[PDB]
C-alpha cells in the first residue's frame, strides 16, 4: 500500500510542491492508431502500438494558501511558459516533465475556502527516475 500523501507535484523556480494539493492526478494517454487490415484471424481489430502519440495531463486541486510556488504558477500562466514539472509516484519515483499551465481557476464561496483547481498537460518528452 502507498500513502496518497506521498505523490507530489512540484514546480521549478530546484523543486517545491504547491500548497493546496488536495487531490492530484497525472493522467497518460495514447490515441490508439487503428491499423485494421481486411485480413485478421477472427475479424479482430489490429492496432499498431508505437505509432500513437502519447501524452500526460496533471489535474491538481487544492485550497489557496499563498506560497511562492503558488505565485509561481500565476507567473507561469501570465508569462506563458512550458517549464519543467515533476510528479513523484511514491515508490516508482519522479516524472520530471515539461508541462504547460493549461487552465487554472480560483474559486470561493460565501462560507467555504479559497479553493483552486490546476489543470496541466504534457509539453514534451517525459522521464522516470525509478
Amino acid at each position: 500500500a502507498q500513502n496518497g500523501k506521498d505523490l507530489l507535484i512540484k514546480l521549478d523556480l530546484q523543486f517545491e510542491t504547491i500548497a493546496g494539493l488536495r487531490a492530484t492526478r497525472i493522467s497518460f494517454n495514447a490515441e490508439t492508431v487503428d491499423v485494421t487490415s481486411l485480413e485478421s484471424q477472427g475479424g479482430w481489430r489490429e492496432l499498431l502500438g508505437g505509432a500513437g502519440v502519447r501524452s500526460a495531463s496533471i489535474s491538481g486541486a487544492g485550497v489557496f494558501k499563498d506560497a511562492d510556488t503558488d505565485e509561481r504558477a500565476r507567473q507561469i500562466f501570465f508569462d506563458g511558459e512550458v517549464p519543467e514539472f515533476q510528479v513523484i509516484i511514491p515508490d516508482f519515483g519522479i516524472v520530471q516533465g515539461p508541462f504547460m499551465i493549461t487552465s487554472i481557476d480560483y474559486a470561493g464561496s460565501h462560507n467555504g475556502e479559497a479553493s483552486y483547481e490546476l489543470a496541466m498537460a504534457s509539453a514534451g518528452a517525459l522521464s522516470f527516475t525509478a
Partner: protein, 134 residues
C-alpha cells in the same frame, strides 16, 4: 510482365473494383436503341487500395511500385471478391484465368504514388488503381 508476388497483405475496407466494357451506343432518338460490344471479356479494374501498417512495411511498399513495378510489369493481384464459368443465369460467364485462382495480373493506374505519414510509425497511401492489362 512478372509473376513476382501478390501484394502486401494489408488492404483497407473500401478496395473497390469491377469489370468494364466499351459497348458503344447510339440511342436511336425516336425509339429503342441498338448497341455493339467488341470485347467478349472485361477489364476487372480494381481501385482504391490502401496500405496501412508501420513504416517498416512502407519501404517494401514504395519500392513495390518502383523495383518490380517500374510501370510495365505484372504483380498478380489478390481479389477479396483454368477457366471460371458463371452459371447463375442460363447464359454463361466462361471468362478465362491466365493466372491461377483469382490472381488477375494488373498494372497500377498512376504516374506517381503518394505515401503519407499519419503518426510516428503510421504509413498511409490513399489509392492505387489498376485495370488488369493482359
Amino acid at each position: 510482365a512478372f509473376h513476382e508476388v501478390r501484394f502486401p497483405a494489408n488492404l483497407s475496407f473500401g478496395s473497390v473494383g469491377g469489370p468494364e466494357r466499351r459497348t458503344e451506343i447510339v440511342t436511336l432518338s425516336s425509339g429503342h436503341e441498338e448497341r455493339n460490344s467488341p470485347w467478349a471479356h472485361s477489364r476487372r479494374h480494381y481501385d482504391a487500395g490502401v496500405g496501412l501498417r508501420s513504416l517498416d512495411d512502407v519501404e517494401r511498399l514504395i519500392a513495390f511500385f518502383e523495383a518490380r513495378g517500374g510501370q510495365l510489369h505484372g504483380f498478380r493481384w489478390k481479389d477479396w471478391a483454368g477457366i471460371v464459368s458463371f452459371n447463375e443465369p442460363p447464359p454463361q460467364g466462361a471468362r478465362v484465368t491466365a493466372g491461377f485462382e483469382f490472381d488477375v495480373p494488373v498494372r497500377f493506374d498512376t504516374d506517381r504514388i503518394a505515401v503519407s505519414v499519419q503518426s510516428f510509425q503510421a504509413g498511409d497511401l490513399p489509392q492505387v488503381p489498376v485495370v488488369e492489362v493482359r
